[PDB]
A paper describes a structure:
In this study, we heterologously expressed and fully characterized a recombinant polyol-specific long-chain GoSLDH. Based on the conserved catalytic motif (KXXXXHXXH) in polyol-specific long-chain dehydrogenase, GoSLDH can be grouped into the subfamily of polyol-specific long-chain dehydrogenases. The observed results suggested that GoSLDH is highly specific towards D-sorbitol, mannitol, and D-arabinitol. Measurement of activity with D-sorbitol as a substrate suggested that GoSLDH is exclusively an NADP+-dependent enzyme, resulting in only 2.5% relative activity with NAD+.
The identified GoSLDH had 32–82% sequence identity with polyol-specific long-chain dehydrogenase family enzymes. Further, the catalytic region of Pseudomonas fluorescens MDH (PfMDH) was identified as the previously suggested conserved sequence (KXXXXNXXH) of polyol-specific long-chain dehydrogenase. This GoSLDH alignment (Q9KWR5) revealed the presence of three highly conserved residues, Lys294, Asn299, and His302, that have been found in other known polyol-specific long-chain dehydrogenases. In addition, GoSLDH possessed the active site residues of Asp190, Val228, Lys294, and Asp299. The structure of GoSLDH and PfMDH bound with D-sorbitol lacked sufficient detail to reveal precisely how it bound. To understand the binding conformation of D-sorbitol along with GoSLDH and PfMDH, molecular docking was performed. D-Sorbitol formed strong interactions of five hydrogen bonds with GoSLDH, with Asn190, Lys294, and Leu191 playing the roles of interacting amino acids. In addition to the hydrogen bonding network, the amino acids Met227, Val287, Ile295, and Phe384 showed hydrophobic bonding with the D-sorbitol in GoSLDH. The distance between Lys294 and the O2 hydrogen atom of D-sorbitol was 2.35 Å, which favors close contact. Given the shorter distance between Lys294 and the O2 hydrogen of the substrate, it seems that GoSLDH could abstract a proton more efficiently than PfMDH. Further, the high activity of GoSLDH was analyzed in a structural analysis together with CV and ITC studies. These observations suggested that recombinant GoSLDH is more catalytically efficient than other SLDH or MDH due to the close proximity of D-sorbitol to the catalytic residue, along with high binding affinity.
Numbering used by the authors: 1 to 484
């Protein structure tokens, strides 16, 4: 059956919004209505709407392309309702019709319409998922780019903007001038200290617009940082058909996500917020510790699994996590090297986190390619492994497993698995010089790759020697033979 406000007589297997859809009112405006938002932010709000019905979400798309209009039409056609299938590693899935998103507006169609929502006193939070590039931070200067075409145009006619920066700042100006209150700017993009990024972008535009205005926003608005997870894959036509065939719903906008989900959010709101804790959102004073748990256990674990997995010849993460030796090595790395040198946030155990990392990697429906996980391996090693290596060296702890990860990465770079297959991993930051080292036939040259610069200031003598010893074993007897 098609999805509609009236046709909410879904099959016994499909759950419906757990609240009166007619009783909820808008409290959040969201920029960038993508899959992640619909399966994460919208997901948590859906669970507190029965408690505080004034937090419905008004979605806004920034592009007015021919494809954008179609999407907006499909949403309105289903009363903005859509189905979300949640699949667990056990293979079992559940499906529900989400009602938190009460309107979907195409900004270009009517700029004033968006601004009206933005200035409404009931709208106390403005969230967004616009990707990193969406924040318009120049990669070289690290500052908000005032040279951007759309930004300059907005600066010329700020009363009728087209960029998120223009809409948000103009809305804040009007609220201020009319005696209203500032709202909370809540980034839900997966970036380190996403709130600080948002603050830089929005205040960067505000400053150019009017110093006094930026001062006001800086003092009254808030830009909390949040850590967000939840794998929510792209939805292809073929994927949509499987989801609908399984749910029994003729959904034009079906999506699926892993059952696992997490949201750590700094409790810094300008004018109130939903009771998100009731939905499992973890409110904190500083997001930093949680970001590092994810970085040093989930991300670090992902590559500790995939680098040697590629050498064994595994194409997907779920195939590698099923390998008894690679799994044991991952657990030993997390238990012996990371957990003992990782600060633990309150209200959770690092061991429980470890268990979730393992379980998630075993979710066949979510499984990604090992080579994809290994792409830009240099930057990943720098960000995910450096702290763990520095601590092991500084505190004089066992380097065996740490060296194995490095040796595996270096051997993986050579481009050949133990089954005879060849491959070419992607390393954007590497040039001819780097790749020459990576492919050298010796076992010492590639130790100079930039991937290991994060701990090069320390005495890496013992670590490097062990790495060499393991690379030798890996090349002659295979990767598993080198596992500590």
């Amino acid at each position: 059956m098609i999805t509609r406000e009236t046709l909410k007589s879904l099959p016994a297997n499909v759950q419906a919004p757990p609240y009166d859809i007619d009783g909820i009112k808008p409290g959040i405006v969201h920029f960038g209505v993508g899959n992640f938002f619909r399966a994460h932010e919208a997901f948590y709000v859906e669970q507190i709407l029965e408690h505080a019905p004034d937090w419905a979400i008004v979605g806004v798309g920034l592009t007015g392309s021919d494809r954008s209009k179609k999407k907006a039409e499909e949403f309105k056609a289903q009363d903005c309702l859509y189905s979300l299938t949640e699949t667990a590693p056990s293979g079992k899935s559940t499906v529900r019709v989400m009602g938190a998103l009460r309107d979907y507006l195409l900004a270009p169609a009517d700029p004033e319409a968006v601004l009206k929502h933005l200035v409404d006193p009931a709208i106390r939070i403005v969230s967004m998922t616009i990707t990193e590039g969406g924040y318009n931070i120049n990669e070289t200067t690290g500052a908000f780019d005032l040279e951007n075409a759309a930004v300059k145009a907005d600066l010329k006619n700020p009363e009728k903007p087209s960029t998120v920066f223009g809409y948000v700042v103009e809305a804040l100006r009007r609220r201020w001038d009319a005696g209203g209150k500032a709202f909370t700017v809540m980034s839900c993009d997966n970036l380190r200290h996403n709130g600080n990024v948002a603050r830089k972008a929005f205040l960067g535009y505000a400053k150019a617009r009017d110093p006094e205005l930026a001062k006001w926003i800086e003092e009254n608005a808030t830009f909390p940082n949040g850590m967000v997870d939840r794998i929510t894959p792209t939805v292809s036509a073929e994927i949509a058909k499987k989801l609908n065939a399984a749910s029994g719903l003729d959904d034009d906008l079906p999506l699926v996500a892993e059952d696992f989900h997490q949201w750590v959010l700094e409790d810094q709101f300008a004018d109130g917020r939903p009771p998100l804790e009731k939905a499992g959102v973890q409110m904190v004073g500083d997001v930093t510790d949680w970001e590092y748990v994810k970085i040093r256990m989930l991300n670090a674990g992902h590559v500790m699994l995939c680098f040697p997995g590629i050498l064994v010849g595994y194409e997907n993460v779920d195939d590698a996590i099923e390998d008894s030796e690679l799994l044991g090595n991952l657990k030993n790395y997390l238990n012996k090297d990371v957990i003992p040198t990782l600060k633990a946030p309150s209200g959770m155990t690092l061991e429980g986190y470890r268990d979730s990392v393992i379980s998630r990697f075993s979710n066949k429906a979510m499984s990604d390619q090992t080579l994809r996980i290994a792409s830009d391996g240099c930057s990943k090693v720098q960000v995910f492994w450096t702290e763990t290596v520095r601590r092991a060296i500084e505190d004089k702890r066992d380097l065996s497993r740490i060296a194995f990860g490095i040796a595996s990465y270096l051997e993986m770079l050579r481009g050949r698995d133990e089954k005879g297959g060849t491959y070419e991993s992607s390393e954007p930051t590497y040039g001819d010089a780097e790749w020459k080292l990576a492919k050298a036939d010796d076992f010492e040259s590639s130790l100079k790759l930039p991937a290991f610069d994060g701990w090069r200031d320390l005495d890496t003598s013992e670590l490097d020697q062990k790495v060499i010893v393991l690379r030798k074993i890996i090349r002659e007897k295979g990767v598993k033979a080198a596992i500590p």
